[PDB]
Design a protein around this ligand. Structure first.
Ligand SMILES: COc1ccccc1CC(=O)N1C[C@]2(C(N)=O)CC[C@H]1C2
Ligand SMILES: [Zn+2]
Length: 140
């Protein structure tokens, strides 16, 4: 589990969104595994606006933050999961790192701010849903 709290937005994995998230929906995209809902309180996270390919992510299944090198956002085939069938997920970045299904929502960050959240993994890989192209998260 986990979310990004920027301005009056909450960014979560679409497959972990709550009823309150759907009832206060701003934007969702199943191909990216992302959903954004509105919040009453202002958040403290800042979004990175950069081309970094190195950063640090939080792994709840180890209670640890790990440094990682990650690929550029791309269209990748992801195996079946109970939340989605085997399909192509867009704006996904891969890295070598430990991940388990419940690690979804952990933040990946660089020196500029939040880059994305854990969305996929298995066998020593971890995948992150990028959010750096969502410029509207910085306004309204
Ligand atoms: C955290 O992902 C891990 C980790 C270890 C093993 C397997 C996975 C992958 C996994 O179960 N999923 C990838 C999902 C997707 N984004 O389509 C999101 C949750 C389902 C579907
Ligand atoms: Zn950066």
């Amino acid at each position: 589990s986990g979310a990004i709290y920027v301005g009056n937005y909450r960014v979560v994995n679409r497959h972990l969104a709550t009823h309150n998230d759907w009832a206060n929906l701003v934007w969702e995209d199943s191909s990216r595994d992302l959903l954004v809902s509105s919040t009453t309180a202002q958040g403290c996270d800042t979004i990175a606006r950069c081309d970094c390919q190195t950063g640090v992510y939080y792994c709840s299944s180890r209670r640890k933050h790990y440094p990682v090198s990650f690929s550029k956002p791309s269209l990748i085939f992801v195996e079946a999961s109970e939340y989605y069938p085997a399909r192509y997920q867009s704006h996904l970045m891969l890295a070598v790192g430990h991940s388990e299904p419940g690690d979804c929502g952990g933040i990946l960050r660089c020196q500029h701010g939040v880059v994305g959240i854990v969305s996929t993994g298995g066998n020593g890989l971890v995948g992150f849903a990028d959010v750096r192209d969502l410029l509207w998260l910085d306004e309204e």
